[PDB]
């Protein structure tokens, strides 16, 4: 929806948004798949009847032998022989329409916001990469750890903080991906990062 709870050193001023409302699960899904799809690296290999050390000679004359009938041992029906239709390496990715890419990211952030978890932040007293600081901030922020958080900030020091913290996941502003988003319970991002987010979709 709209109105989002922005947190600052000056209190909890709740600004407004523009994100849509109608959350279409299927669409959201397609995107997520596309993600878990493009990362799928093809490495599974099975040397077919072709690439097998075995000779090319015929085992029996296939006549007046009393035996079955074959050529070389490279035949699949020769335990050890070439795989029949074994999967060879190949890409699993494609090109999901850009519109959808954004449409999802919108409905995504909009969903967790609509539920009431999109806490925009700014005041980061976490002077450096010292986890203690972060957990001390999150504590006074409303993040007792009972909810997995996606931390989107520009500062690389804030990374350090929740970087090791198990119940949280750091991420770049552009790193906004529909997977990790709909992969956590809470979403909390830097106001400045909410700006670049408004760039892709505002």
Partner RNA sequence: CGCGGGGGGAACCUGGGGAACUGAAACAUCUCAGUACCCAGAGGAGAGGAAAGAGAAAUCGACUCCCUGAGUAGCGGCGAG
Partner RNA sequence: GAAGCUGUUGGGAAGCAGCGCCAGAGAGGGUGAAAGCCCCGUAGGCGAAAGGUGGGGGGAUAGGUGAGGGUACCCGAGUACCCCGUGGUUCGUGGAGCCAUGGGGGAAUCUGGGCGGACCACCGCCUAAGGCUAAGUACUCCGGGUGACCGAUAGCGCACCAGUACCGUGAGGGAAAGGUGAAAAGAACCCCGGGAGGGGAGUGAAAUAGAGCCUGAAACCGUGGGCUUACAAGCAGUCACGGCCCCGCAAGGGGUUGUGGCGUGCCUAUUGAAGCAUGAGCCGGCGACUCACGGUCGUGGGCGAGCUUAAGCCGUUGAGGC
Partner RNA sequence: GGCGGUAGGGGAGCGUUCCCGAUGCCGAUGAAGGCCGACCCGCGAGGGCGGCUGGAGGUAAGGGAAGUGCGAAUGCCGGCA
Partner RNA sequence: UGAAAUUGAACUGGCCGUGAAGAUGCGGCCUACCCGUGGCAGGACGAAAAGACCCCGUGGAGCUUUACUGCAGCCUGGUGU
Q: Which of residues 75-134 bind another protein (CB under 8 A)?
A: 111-112, 115
What CA–CA distance (Å, rounded) separates 184 from 166?
A: 12
The CB-nearest residue to Mg ion is: 56
DSSP state of 15: E
Counting contacts by CB under 7 A, is residue 136 touching RNA?
Answer: no
Which of the ranges 2-10, 11-19, 90-98, 112-120 carries the binding residues for RNA, by CB under 7 A?
90-98
Per partner kind, with CB cut-offs from 5 to 8 A, the member of another protein, Mg ion, RNA, none near residue 69 is RNA
The closest of 136, 121, 137 to 12, measured between CA atoms, is: 121
Helix (H) or strand (E) segment spanning residue 118: strand 118-121
The rounded distance, in Å, linking the Cα atoms of 109 and 46 is 42
Report the site for Mg ion in 31-90 (rule: CB under 5 A).
53, 56, 63
Which partner from the list Mg ion, another protein, RNA, none does 25 bind, CB cut-off 5 to 8 Å by kind?
Answer: another protein
Total interface residues for another protein by CB under 8 A: 12
Contact status: 69 vs another protein (CB under 8 A): no
Report whether 15 contacts 29 (CB < 8 A). Answer: no
Interaction of residue 132 with Mg ion, rule CB under 5 A: no
From RNA, Mg ion, another protein, none, interface partner of 86 (C-beta below 5 to 8 A by class):
RNA
Of 6-14, 65-73, 111-119, 136-144, the window that binds RNA (rule: CB under 7 A) is 65-73
Query: Per rule CB under 7 A, is residue 101 in the interface with RNA?
Result: yes
Closest by CA position to 147, among listed 157, 160, 162, 129: 162
Q: Shortest distance, CB of residue 25 to another protein, whole angstroms? A: 6
Q: Would you count residue 16 as binding RNA (CB under 7 A)?
A: no
Structure tokens at 131: 């986890």
Q: What is the DSSP string of 130-195?
A: -HHHHHHHHHTTT--SSS-EEEE-S-HHHHHHHHH-TTEEEE-STT--HHHHTTSSEEEEEHHHHH
124 binds RNA (CB under 7 A): no
99 binds, among RNA, another protein, Mg ion, none (CB under 5 to 8 A by kind): RNA
């Amino acid at each position: 929806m709209y109105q989002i709870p922005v947190l600052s050193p000056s209190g909890r001023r709740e600004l407004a948004a523009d994100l849509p409302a109608e959350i279409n699960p299927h669409l959201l899904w397609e995107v997520v798949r596309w993600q878990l799809a493009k990362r799928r690296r093809g490495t599974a290999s099975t040397k077919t009847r072709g690439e097998v050390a075995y000779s090319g000679r015929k085992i029996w004359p296939q006549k007046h032998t009393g035996r079955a009938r074959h050529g070389d041992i490279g035949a699949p029906i020769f335990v050890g022989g070439g795989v029949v239709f074994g999967p060879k390496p190949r890409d699993y990715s494609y090109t999901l329409p850009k519109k959808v890419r954004k449409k999802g990211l919108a409905m995504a952030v909009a969903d967790r916001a609509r539920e009431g978890k999109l806490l925009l932040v700014e005041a980061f007293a976490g002077v450096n990469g010292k986890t203690k600081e972060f957990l001390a901030w999150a504590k006074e922020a409303g993040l007792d750890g009972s909810e997995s958080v996606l931390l989107v900030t520009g500062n690389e020091l804030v990374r350090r903080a929740a970087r090791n913290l198990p119940w949280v996941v750091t991420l770049a502003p552009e790193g906004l991906n529909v997977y990790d988003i709909v992969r956590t319970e809470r979403l909390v991002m830097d106001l400045d990062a909410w700006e670049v987010f408004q760039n892709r979709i505002g």
